[PDB]
Structures are given as C-alpha cells and as structure tokens.
Amino acid sequence: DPTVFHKRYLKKIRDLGEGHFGKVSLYCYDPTNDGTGEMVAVKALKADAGPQHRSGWKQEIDILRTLYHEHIIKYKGCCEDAGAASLQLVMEYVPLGSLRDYLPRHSIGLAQLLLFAQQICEGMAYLHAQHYIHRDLAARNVLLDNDRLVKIGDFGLAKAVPEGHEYYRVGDSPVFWYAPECLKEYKFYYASDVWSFGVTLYELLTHCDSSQSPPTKFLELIGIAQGQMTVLRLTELLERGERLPRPDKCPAEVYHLMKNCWETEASFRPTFENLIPILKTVHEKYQG
Numbered sequence: 001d002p003t004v005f006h007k008r009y010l011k012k013i014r015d016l017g018e019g020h021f022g023k024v025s026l027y028c029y030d031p032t033n034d035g036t037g038e039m040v041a042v043k044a045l046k047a048d049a050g051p052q053h054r055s056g057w058k059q060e061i062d063i064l065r066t067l068y069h070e071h072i073i074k075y076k077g078c079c080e081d082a083g084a085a086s087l088q089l090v091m092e093y094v095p096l097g098s099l100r101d102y103l104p105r106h107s108i109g110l111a112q113l114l115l116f117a118q119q120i121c122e123g124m125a126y127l128h129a130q131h132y133i134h135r136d137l138a139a140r141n142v143l144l145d146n147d148r149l150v151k152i153g154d155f156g157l158a159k160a161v162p163e164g165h166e167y168y169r170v171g172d173s174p175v176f177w178y179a180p181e182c183l184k185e186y187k188f189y190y191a192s193d194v195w196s197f198g199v200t201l202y203e204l205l206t207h208c209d210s211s212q213s214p215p216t217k218f219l220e221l222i223g224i225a226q227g228q229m230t231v232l233r234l235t236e237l238l239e240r241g242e243r244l245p246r247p248d249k250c251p252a253e254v255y256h257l258m259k260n261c262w263e264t265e266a267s268f269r270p271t272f273e274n275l276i277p278i279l280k281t282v283h284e285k286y287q288g
C-alpha cells in the first residue's frame with residue numbers, strides 16, 4: 001500500500017520534529033505548481049545511520065503500511081529518497097501538532113482530556129489487536145487533529161510480538177514511561193504499553209507542564225548524584241510502590257485508574273480493551 005509521491009513536487013516548508021534516527025518535516029506536495037497542493041508530514045531516516053537503524057526503518061514502514069484506524073495517523077504513501085538510499089514515509093499533516101506542544105499553551109478542560117485518553121486507548125487496542133507493541137507511548141507522540149480528536153502519530157519503537165510469545169525482548173529508551181519489567185527483565189509486554197498510557201494520562205492531567213513531567217519528578221526522587229544508577233534507582237523506587245503524584249484537580253477516581261495502570265504486577269493491569277468502556281463512561285460523566 002499505496003501511493004508514490006514524487007520528490008520533484010515536494011516543497012519543504014518547516015521542520016516538525018525529530019524522534020529516533022528520523023526527522024519529520026512539513027512539505028507541500030504540488031504537482032500543478034499552484035499552491036493548491038496538499039500539506040503532508042514526511043518522516044525520513046536521519047542524515048547518517050547504520051544497519052540497526054536501517055533494518056528498524058524498514059520495519060517501521062511496513063507496520064505503518066498495515067495500520068488503519070480512526071486514531072492512528074493516516075499513512076498516505078512513500079517517496080523514493082535516493083538520497084539516503086531508503087524511502088521517506090508520507091503521512092497526513094495535523095497542524096495543531098502534539099499534545100505536548102499544545103496543552104502547555106491551551107487551557108483544556110477535564111472532559112476533553114478524558115476524551116483524548118479514551119481515544120488513545122482505542123488506537124492502542126486496535127494496535128494490540130494487530131499484534132504490535134508501541135513501546136513509546138507519550139504525549140509527544142499523540143497528535144491533536146482537532147478538538148474532539150487525537151491520533152497516535154509515531155511508531156519508531158513499535159514491534160510485532162512473536163506469534164508464539166506474550167512479550168518482546170528489548171540507549172534511547174524513554175525509561176521514565178516504562179514499567180519495572182521493562183527496566184529490569186528487558187521484556188516488553190502488552191501490559192507494558194498500559195503502564196506507559198498511565199504516564200501519558202498523567203501528562204494530560206498536568207497539561208504537560210515541564211516542571212511536573214515524569215523525568216523531572218522521578219529525577220527529584222532519584223537525585224542526580226549518581227547518574228550511573230538512574231535506571232537501578234528508578235526500578236527500586238517503583239518496586240517500593242512510589243508513584244507519580246496526583247495532578248491538581250485530577251478526580252480521585254481517575255487517579256485510581258492511573259494507579260491501576262501502574263500495577264507493579266503486569267497481569268493486574270487492565271488491557272486497553274478494558275479501559276475503553278471505563279473511560280467513555282467517565283468521559284460522559286464529566287460533561288454533564
């Protein structure tokens with residue numbers, strides 16, 4: 001699947017981001033040279049990269065080729081880049097950008113946040129239905145299309161789960177979004193994405209305020225006196241049962257659900273399938 005965009009019609013406008021070994025850029029695709037052309041977000045493999053990076057990139061392209069859902073960024077096509085000697089990944093451009101760039105500048109109410117949470121779970125259930133783990137679920141990878149719509153917008157760490165396994169075995173790791181089993185056993189379950197969702201939910205309820213972020217909060221608890229032992233120390237504080245605190249005006253019951261996504265024991269966490277009904281009921285509740 002499907003379309004081939006010719007780089008001769010692609011006009012670079014703007015850098016939108018930088019993720020793993022890729023950059024996402026805004027282009028205008030203008031065959032008729034008119035300005036009528038469509039704006040598209042284009043992900044490319046970085047200005048230098050080795051065999052590990054490249055084998056990953058091919059996997060990312062194939063995963064995003066086969067995903068199709070209301071709350072997953074729309075895959076539009078590829079672009080030969082000869083170049084870097086690989087393809088560029090072309091997707092729809094969502095101009096409001098990530099929740100991480102958006103929420104710190106726009107006072108969004110509780111009901112809308114829970115709606116986004118519901119929607120993130122929907123996309124994640126679908127993704128788990130298709131047998132993938134995301135491994136990088138955080139507010140910076142959730143795109144606000146409008147208002148009443150979010151999409152999961154990046155798959156750079158996503159992996160298929162081996163058809164006869166419960167997990168995938170794994171640096172650039174977003175460790176402050178990771179469950180203990182990922183930091184310790186280096187295994188990544190479906191339940192491990194639910195932990196990350198709990199942190200993303202915490203991010204939303206704090207409007208992604210930089211001072212309240214997980215790295216900031218966790219490094220305040222851990223201290224920076226021994227950088228060598230950050231992961232070790234994070235794992236111990238988590239296994240001790242210490243958690244990220246309640247965000248201001250977070251309803252008691254929502255922090256409860258948050259904590260339940262943070263069960264130390266993975267099997268005690270809800271699936272994304274479990275969360276969809278709970279979230280949409282709590283969403284409904286908070287409008288009226």
Ligand SMILES: C[C@@H]1CCN(C(=O)CC#N)C[C@@H]1N(C)c1ncnc2[nH]ccc12
Nearest residue numbers: 017018019022023024041093094153154
């Ligand atoms: C949040 C989106 C996913 C992560 N982004 C990266 O740059 C990852 C890498 N490398 C940016 C992207 N983003 C700001 C976007 N912004 C606007 N439209 C977009 N369409 C698709 C992505 C996108």
